């Protein structure tokens, strides 16, 4: 995808993440765990439902039209009736093919983007207290217990509290 | 003494193949079908008013072939002509049959 | 039974935007196309393995 996260610096997806589309796994002094990220998951779901609802909205209603099957050879007028219909069908078939190609390219890119946005947001919270290991994981350079991990996950992590400890570990 | 925090996304053992701009087939976690390809094989009688022609064409009902006179003064949203229809009155033709049939049907 | 869309094959659902049942239709109907299937992705790339 365009952002290089999904099938990129994130090496693979997690079959064990069964309660969200995007999320976190951690290891700290209290063990390991996993949690779905609700906001990123819902942003992707909401965009996908948005495009689905635009696509499946409003079939056209048509009533009396032209005949499209014929039991006798007639020549010129029938030739034209059949050509008009064949022309119409080929144009709609082209629209249908192109629509799903464009939509699908974009769905892959928007989901890749949501992964990348979560990663960047997490990085920004951590400031100088962590480093990007290059595989979608952050090495956090301070003791970070379950409540600390949850503070990152819920967006209230206070980098200043841990900065002295982390810098000592990173740089000295 | 520290911790590791990994970001990730879900996956399933087998997803669905779709087409994109650059790929004829690529696997995603889920997709939905946009082409209706099946029918029950029955015409539903609601909400449209359906008139089954049975043994009669619309033109035979129009003219009043006796076995079609059941259809006198009938109305429809959709008239359904059956392949088993037959004429049983004076033999006739209609120059521009298709147009008379169309304008009455409409 | 109830259906907005009628084809000579029978009624069909009209929740999808396209259909490949019959070019002849009456009512609120999906548009006839040649393809017998077209899948709209509703999830991200599935990457269970590297």
């Amino acid at each position, epitope marked *: 995808g365009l952002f290089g996260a999904i099938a990129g610096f994130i090496e693979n997806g997690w079959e064990g993440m069964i*309660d*969200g*589309w995007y999320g976190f796994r951690h290891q700290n002094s209290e063990g390991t765990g996993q949690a*779905a990220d*609700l906001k990123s*998951t*819902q942003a992707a*779901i*909401d965009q*996908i*439902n*948005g495009k*689905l*609802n635009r696509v*499946i909205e409003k079939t056209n209603e048509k009533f009396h039209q032209i005949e499209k099957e014929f039991s006798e050879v007639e020549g010129r007028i029938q030739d034209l009736e059949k050509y008009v219909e064949d022309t119409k069908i080929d144009l709609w078939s082209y629209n249908a093919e192109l629509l799903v190609a464009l939509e699908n390219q974009h769905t892959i890119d928007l989901t890749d983007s949501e992964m990348n946005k979560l990663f960047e947001k997490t990085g920004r919270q951590l400031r100088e207290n962590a480093e990007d290991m290059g595989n979608g994981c952050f090495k956090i350079y301070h003791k970070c217990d379950n409540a600390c991990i949850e503070s990152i996950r819920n967006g209230t992590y206070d980098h200043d509290v841990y900065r002295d400890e982390a810098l000592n570990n990173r740089f000295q | 003494p520290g911790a590791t925090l990994c970001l990730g996304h879900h996956a399933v053992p087998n997803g669905t193949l779709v087409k994109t701009i650059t790929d004829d087939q690529i696997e995603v*976690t*889920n997709a*939905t079908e946009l082409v209706q390809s099946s029918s029950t094989g029955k015409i539903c009688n609601n909400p449209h008013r359906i008139l089954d022609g049975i043994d009669c064409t619309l033109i035979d009902a129009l003219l009043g072939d006796p076995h079609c006179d059941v259809f006198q003064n009938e109305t429809w949203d959709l008239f359904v002509e059956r392949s088993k229809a037959f004429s049983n009155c004076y033999p006739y033709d209609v120059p521009d049959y298709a147009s008379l049939r169309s304008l009455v049907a409409s | 039974c109830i259906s907005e869309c009628i084809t000579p094959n029978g009624s069909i659902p009209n*929740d*999808k935007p396209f259909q490949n049942v019959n070019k002849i239709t009456y009512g609120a109907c999906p548009k006839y196309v040649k393809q017998n299937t077209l899948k709209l992705a*509703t*999830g991200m790339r599935n990457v269970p393995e590297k």
Partner: antibody
Amino acid sequence: QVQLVQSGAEVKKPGSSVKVSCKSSGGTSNNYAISWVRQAPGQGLDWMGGISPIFGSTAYAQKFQGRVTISADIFSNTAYMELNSLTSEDTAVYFCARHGNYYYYSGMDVWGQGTTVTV
Amino acid sequence: SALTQPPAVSGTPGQRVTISCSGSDSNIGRRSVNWYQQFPGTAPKLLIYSNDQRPSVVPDRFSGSKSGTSASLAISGLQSEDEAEYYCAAWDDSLKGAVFGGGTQLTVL
């Protein structure tokens, strides 16, 4: 402002099945989880399960697993609950309710009017 | 069950009333609590979510809190229109499903 509108009251004989619908009007609910919650006469609320149809999740309470089928039609913006093998223990009002997001943890903030099922 | 509430609470107009909700580690302990209000024969209404968060349409006299494996709904300044059934709720990670308390009937004296 979305409203959830449920199908009408049902009277059912023992062993039969009932399928209740929940239509989202005034907007879609396809990007949210909708749960089904029942309330037996004089009793409390009881979760049956839920569905989040674009996300692709259907969940069931263990106590109803195998007897209930929850489904959705994203094109008509409707969710459904079908409960099989009915007995008098299933006489209850059945509600559909939409969660604040795509999954079942969030508070249920939009509720249908309820559907009475009498067995 | 799973969550346990007193069957009944009462108060006078203007009084402060509290409704308790006892759970376990698999629900209240590790998950967020929601509270619902229900008038007879009508659908429940969301009153509190995420433990202490209040929807904009809900009066500020309603508040919630969570400590350990317990939760509490407080109604400051009781009004007559508050006579209703109240339910606590949370996800349960052991049952893998949503659970509710048995409900508390509030009577305005």
